[PDB]
Structure formats: structure tokens, C-alpha cells
Amino acid sequence: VSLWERFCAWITSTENRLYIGWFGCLMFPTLLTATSCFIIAFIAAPPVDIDGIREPVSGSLLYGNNIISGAVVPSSNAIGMHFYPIWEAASVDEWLYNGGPYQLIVLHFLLGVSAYMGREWELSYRLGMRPWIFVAFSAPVAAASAVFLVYPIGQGSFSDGMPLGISGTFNFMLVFQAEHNILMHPFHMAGVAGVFGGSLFSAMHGSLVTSSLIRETTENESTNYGYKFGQEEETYNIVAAHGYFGRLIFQYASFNNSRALHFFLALWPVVGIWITAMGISTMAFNLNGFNFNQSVVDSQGRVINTWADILNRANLGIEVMHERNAHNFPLDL
Amino acid sequence: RLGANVSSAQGPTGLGKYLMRSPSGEIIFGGETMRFWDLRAPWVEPLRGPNGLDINKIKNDIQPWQERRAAEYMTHAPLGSLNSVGGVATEINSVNYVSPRSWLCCSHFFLAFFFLVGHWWHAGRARAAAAGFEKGIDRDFEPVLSMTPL
């Protein structure tokens, strides 16, 4: 029995409190350093110039911020897309002045979530189950990559990525609306439909299952105590739930193969989020949503406003104000 | 052309609105386009020296064809909409143009990610089928019940 073997075995063991696996060798150190740097920076990071115009923005708790206003400000616009690790700066203070911690945290977080997907698959393989949970987890990973990496790549600067904070997230969303018209993009519509449908189906499935629960408890005891871990029979009556659902809407319209029902539950939000991440990715290369500006014209030629023109008005209001000092020329290219 | 001394006019932030210095020291165009200082185009290289954008060439040896090329490129930027309105999202729809670069990049990025998803799905299924539990668990040889508790 060699040493390598022994190791490989401990690593791929399924009796450890938390599964390590080979993807864990990438997930654990990377996520740990990302979270350590994030926690330190959220508390004591000095101001950073993000627009590269020598106007630093404070985002740390010790610099007069609260939980909502605080954020990890993305790297400077002067750097752009350039790689900026610690050792390329002449001093740590300068590294902090140009927003290096944002790059560090975001790159490590992306590697960590990819390794997290891999580790999910690896444990699925070890336990002898069907290996497609990480496919479902791919959708949030794709969304995070689009918002943190793909959009800066398309725009050409890391300063365009989503800042790690609440108010920073809202600022990113508003500027995205102004410069890109996300709402009128069919992929954002698909994503909103997917999220609303996911909530709808979650609530309805939970209500239908809990409503039809076999009576195996008193009244002075939590209904949840009727079920025992490791049961052999279904604690709920599918027949009653399907009868209620069919009578509610229609007989034909109803799922019976609970397997098909759960597959649909998995399918709806996942495809919605995939389509949304594709909206963000496509719009990172300036393929914006529909522009129905001045589409309606009367006989003479005068323009009649629609509801889209008021959206354009709000977009103009946001646009002429964002990054007030950064621009020097009429067009935002 | 108006006679303003280029490379001496401080910008609104005091940084310089026409000529700046790159973080490596090279002389580049100012404004928000300082993020794109890595650019190398055939119509702008004639003006570049070893130190960056040469100033004596800009002040004296400028060419009309460069002006025409720059105007045409500014007037045709890779900006557009799904219905191909063209221009900025807030612009009215009179022009009809979306750059083929945008089409190619967006379409192929979409296809590339969905083929990555295909890789994930098929790799998982292929390995599960080779192992022999791509249809279920077993219900009589469930591996979870044979492992130590935790």
C-alpha cells in the first residue's frame, strides 16, 4: 500500500463529514481565500478610483458606510481589462488604490463555483446516483460568470463589472437599463417568466403536497412529526392532490407521472435563468433590446408617443447622469 | 482646427481631455477611451512612435483619409438593437444597421455556452452509463446504506 494510494483514497472517501474529492482540491483553497479577502475588504478597504478620473469612492465599513451602502468597488477604469495581481503593483497601498481586491475576489469566486459544480458531480458519482444536479446548478454559475466576467470582457473594462454590494448592485442594474434597455430584451422577459413561474410552481406544489397528508398525528403535535426518516411508503396521497388539481383547472390539464412533474419543476427556472444569462452575454457585445422609439406617426408625420417613448425618456434621464465626470465626447462608445 | 493647443487642455477632472498617459507611461487618447489604449489599427499606427502617440505627427502630419476613416467608424459603431434600430438605445430609429461583429460574437457565444452545457450533460450521462446506474439506484444494493453513518 503506497502513500499516493492511501491519499487518493482519503480524498475520494464518502465517510468524511464534508466530501473533499478532487474538485475540492480546487474549490476549498480558492473559495477560502476569496471569502477571507472579501471579509477583510468589506471592513477596511481604503477608497478606490473606479472611473480612473482620480475620484476615489469609499466602500468600506470603517469609512462611513453601512451594510447596504458598503461594497467592494471594482477595479479602476485605467487598468481596463489588464491583469492586476498583487505582485504587479509597486506597493500594497497602490494595489488598494486601483481596486485589485475586486479582481482577486472575483477570479477566485468564479474558479470556486466551477469547482463546486465539479464537486457536486463527483459526489453524485461516488454515491451511485444520476449525475445531473450540477447541470441545474450551471444556471446560477452562468449568470454569475456573465455578470462578473463576460460583461467586463465585452465592454472592455473590469470597472463595468457588478460591484460586490447592495447599492452597487442597484447602480449596476440602473446603468445597464440606461445603456442597454434590458427590460425590452426578450431574454430578460424569459427570465422574469422563469422566476415567476418557479415561485408559482414551488408554492403550488408545496400546497398540494402538504394539503394531502395522511393523518398520522394528533392535533397537539406538529404535522411534520407524522413522517419518519427512512420511510417505505408515501406520506402523501397523490390521488387526492391530482383530483383537486384537475377539478381546479381542467381534467386533461394535469400531471400524473410525478416524475414528469418534478422534471418540469427542474426544467422551468433552469431554462429561464440560462436564457437570461444569454441575454446579459449577448448585450455585453451591444445587441440591445427592442427600440420602438417614434414608431407611431400620424398622417402628417408628427410623432405620437407610446409607452416605449416614456421608457426612452427615463433611460435618457439615467444616461445623462451616470458617471457625470467620466465623459468628454457626445457618444458613449 | 479651431486653434486649441491639443495636449495642453486640462479635462474637467484635470486629467487631460485629448492626450493622457497610460499606466505604462505611453501617450494615449484621453477620456473614457483610456481603457482601450491597447488598440492598434492601420489608420492610427502612422501616428504612433516608440513613445506612444507622437505629438509632432499629430500637430503637423495629419491626413484627410484618416479623418474620413475615423468619421466613418465613429458613425458606424458596433451598437444596435434586436430589431436593428442602430445607434444608442435612446436614439430614434432612422438608421438601420447592426455591425456583423456584434451578430457573430453574440450568436457564437450563445452556441459555445450551450455546447459547454451539452458537454456537462453528456459527460455525466456517459460516465453514469459506463458505471451502470444511469437508470436508478437499485433498491436492494443502495450504496448509501452500506456506508458508515455520520
Partner: peptide
């Protein structure tokens, strides 16, 4: 001075998360 309160709240939440993973009720069959 409120930075102290914010830090305390965040660290307390993290500690609660820590106790819910390594000090959980073991589910038995």
C-alpha cells in the same frame, strides 16, 4: 462607532451558520 455593531452582527450570523453545520441534529433512520 456603528461599524462595531455591523461587524458584530455579521460575525454573529456567521457563528450561527457555523453551529448549524457542525452541531446539527443527526438524522437517523
Amino acid at each position: 462607532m456603528e461599524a462595531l455593531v455591523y461587524t458584530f452582527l455579521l460575525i454573529g450570523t456567521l457563528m450561527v451558520i457555523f453551529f448549524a453545520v457542525f452541531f446539527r441534529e443527526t438524522p437517523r433512520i
